[PDB]
RNA sequence: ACGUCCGUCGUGAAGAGGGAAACAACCCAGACCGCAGCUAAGGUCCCAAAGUCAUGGUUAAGUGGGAAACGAUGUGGGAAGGCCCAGACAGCCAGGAUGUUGGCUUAGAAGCAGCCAUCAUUUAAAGAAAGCGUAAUAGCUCACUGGUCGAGUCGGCCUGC
RNA sequence: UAUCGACGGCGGUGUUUGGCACCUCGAUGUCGGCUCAUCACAUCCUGGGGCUGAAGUAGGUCCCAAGGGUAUGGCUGUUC
RNA sequence: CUAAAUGCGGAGAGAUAAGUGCUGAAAGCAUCUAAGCACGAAACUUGCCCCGAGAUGAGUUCUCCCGAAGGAACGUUGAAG
């Protein structure tokens, strides 16, 4: 699927947004996912809102990858109208070795349980990384 | 190898794959044929294969148990004490078939397996003693089985049931 | 006896004739024998006093044209057909007196009150 | 819509022979005649013609072939944290308390709906309490400690079927 | 989290519909019904079970099961 | 001959599923199992009735041609067609 964006027509809005956590200090942690895959904005919200709703203990939870690749669909016959932007909103491109969610935290992992809850929402076997 | 000492009042003899235990209560002959050689020492019955595979130990655990079971069943034996109860119509439990259960017309019965005594005195307690274990434990379980309300009528309301006091 | 049939009344509720509707507990190609309770809608009667002509009630067949055989081997046959109207009160005639004979099996085992008012028994 | 129109490949085209059970394209390999020998396809225990052939290993399923998002102390292998024989980590026995039914809220909630705190007491231990349970209590476990048990145990990452 | 169950995500069936024209228009005349012969199962009651907003009772939903039985009219040519 | 007629049309036994238990390991505890074992469905097999040697295990029996120990054909009629 040739990477896409817009410069076309305006579609729906972002189901995501709340970056959460404080960004006064930049860290280098994360949660890598072995395997490339396209994740829609919605599923990203469910996973993000899953951990954020569990890491009430603190914060410093952040995400680097965001959906920037639109995908249109077409319901009915066919013969006039390339594609409209429906349920299929922006989608993020994840690399075989890309870090998605990283939380600035020293060995006190209380979010591993949160990342686990989210790891069951995105279609891809993710693994927990300390580095 | 798991040596199993034998009581002073127990005498066991083995000839091939057959193991016979003698004592006071009676005698019990059992056969244990597998990838193991069971021999009897002047003071202990030995059991120890050559390999240590899982299936080799699994059979070792049951063997030692069966043997230990044949020892107690000859020195003490097997006996279960059961008692009948009924709020309303007394259930007449006879050596043949029980009657007047919950007030039902026809009686409920169950064939007596093997050859064990189930003498039941005219009271609230009964006894089912025998030589075999898988028998004295079945006849006692079935006795309660039929006492279990067949219809879709939950318990609590129907106390009538002859449960076993001691195992 | 089938549906849409015309039979006479045996009680005195003010009704003369009756138009059989259907039977209770019987799904067959038209049928309604003696002893079978059936809901009907009288035709000829007294249109006053209490809305009679038009209302739908229940009744019990007593006599029919069809001949029924008895244990001995003899068959009995009647002229037309008749029935007795009953109210909500579990099997209870609305009228006071009943006209016409009745069967035997329709007594002891089943109804014990209908026999007490039966002026004839075959 | 049993396409229009491009790209790769492959066949129908101009293909033997041959295996793949059968087969347009998968693998190998290319036709004179008769004949001899040796190889390829594939097959080589028997029908069937050819070794029931050599070394090593796996599975045990007869799997020998549809099979998936998802689950699994079935089992085998490897790396890494902590606790280990100056009686612990797990079993078994007995505790697990006192102000307090903490405050608030709530018809009621008295460790355990929810809302905020979460100190102090006796002290070997006992969190105003991690779960089950009650309408609310009660009751039953855990955390923690002692005795006994005396040994491999526990959390965790990856890989094969 | 005990019926109901949104947003979102992941699937199965292909009974529905829209429907990419290699198969038949050198043409397997059209729907439904009717009548007649032959070969099967993702079912309502009853029976045996799972969950329970299952205390009991009465119900809701789901699995299983053909063993028996599905026998009828008025308007419209009409099929649902 | 028929009919809105009449007489007749099992029980039981055996093996399993769901499920209920026994004994007993892998984890010296525990556990319905993993080996073994006792029970457990109108369903399965049989029993019962009907058809049936073109049922390729395509049958059997006795007697009839092995120089005669019968049979096909024929005649008169059907509890047959």
Swiss-Prot record, chain A:
Keywords: Hydroxylation, Methylation, Ribonucleoprotein, Ribosomal protein, RNA-binding, rRNA-binding, tRNA-binding
MF GO annotations: rRNA binding; structural constituent of ribosome; tRNA binding
Domain of life (superkingdom): Bacteria
Post-translational modification: Is hydroxylated on Arg-79 by RoxA. The modification is nearly suppressed when E.coli is grown in anoxia.
Residues recorded as bearing (3R)-3-hydroxyarginine in the entry: 79
Annotated Gene Ontology cellular component terms: cytoplasm; cytosolic large ribosomal subunit
Gene3D superfamilies in UniProt: Ribosomal protein L10e/L16 (3.90.1170.10)
GO BP, sorted A to Z: cytoplasmic translation; ribosomal large subunit assembly
Function: Binds directly to 23S ribosomal RNA and is located at the A site of the peptidyltransferase center. It contacts the A and P site tRNAs. One of the last ribosomal proteins to be assembled in the 50S subunit. The simultaneous presence of uL16 and bL36 probably triggers ObgE's GTPase activity and eventual dissociation from the mature 50S ribosmal subunit. It has an essential role in subunit assembly.
Subunit structure: Part of the 50S ribosomal subunit. Cross-links to the A and P site tRNAs. Interacts with assembly factor DarP(YjgA).
NCBIfam families (UniProt xref): rplP_bact (TIGR01164)
Assigned protein family: Belongs to the universal ribosomal protein uL16 family.
Name of the protein described by the UniProt record: Large ribosomal subunit protein uL16
From Swiss-Prot, chain B:
Top-level taxonomic group: Bacteria
The protein's assembly and partners: Part of the 50S ribosomal subunit.
Alphabetical list of InterPro entries matching this protein: Ribosomal_uL6-like (IPR000702), Ribosomal_uL6-like_a/b-dom_sf (IPR036789), Ribosomal_uL6_a/b-dom (IPR020040), Ribosomal_uL6_bac-type (IPR019906), Ribosomal_uL6_CS (IPR002358)
Residues forming coiled coils: none
Family affiliation: Belongs to the universal ribosomal protein uL6 family.
GO molecular function, one term: large ribosomal subunit rRNA binding
HAMAP family (UniProt xref): Ribosomal_uL6_B
Listed GO CC annotations: cytoplasm; cytosol; cytosolic large ribosomal subunit
PROSITE patterns according to UniProt: RIBOSOMAL_L6_1 (PS00525)
Modified sites of kind N6-acetyllysine: 39
Name by which UniProt lists this protein: Large ribosomal subunit protein uL6
Keyword entries, A-Z: Acetylation, Antibiotic resistance, Ribonucleoprotein, Ribosomal protein, RNA-binding, rRNA-binding
Species of provenance: Escherichia coli (strain K12)
BP terms from Gene Ontology: cytoplasmic translation; response to antibiotic; ribosomal large subunit assembly
Role according to the record: This protein binds directly to at least 2 domains of the 23S ribosomal RNA, thus is important in its secondary structure. It is located near the subunit interface in the base of the L7/L12 stalk, and near the tRNA binding site of the peptidyltransferase center. Gentamicin-resistant mutations in this protein affect translation fidelity.
UniProtKB/Swiss-Prot annotation, chain C:
Entry-linked PANTHER family: 50S/60S RIBOSOMAL PROTEIN L14/L23 (PTHR11761), LARGE RIBOSOMAL SUBUNIT PROTEIN UL14M (PTHR11761:SF3)
A single GO molecular function term of this UniProt record: large ribosomal subunit rRNA binding
Gene3D superfamilies, sorted: Ribosomal protein L14
Designated name of the protein: Large ribosomal subunit protein uL14
Complexes and interactors: Part of the 50S ribosomal subunit. Forms a cluster with proteins L3 and L19. Forms two bridges to the 30S subunit in the 70S ribosome, contacting the 16S rRNA. In pre-50S ribosomal subunits interacts with RsfS, which may inhibit association with the 30S subunit.
PROSITE patterns hit by this protein: RIBOSOMAL_L14 (PS00049)
Gene: rplN
GO cellular component: cytoplasm; cytosol; cytosolic large ribosomal subunit
Entry's family note: Belongs to the universal ribosomal protein uL14 family.
Alphabetized NCBIfam families for the sequence: rplN_bact
Superkingdom of origin organism: Bacteria
An example Gene Ontology biological process: cytoplasmic translation
Keyword rRNA-binding (UniProt): yes
Main function: Binds to 23S rRNA. Forms part of two intersubunit bridges in the 70S ribosome. In the 3.5 A resolved structures L14 and L19 interact and together make contact with the 16S rRNA in bridges B5 and B8.
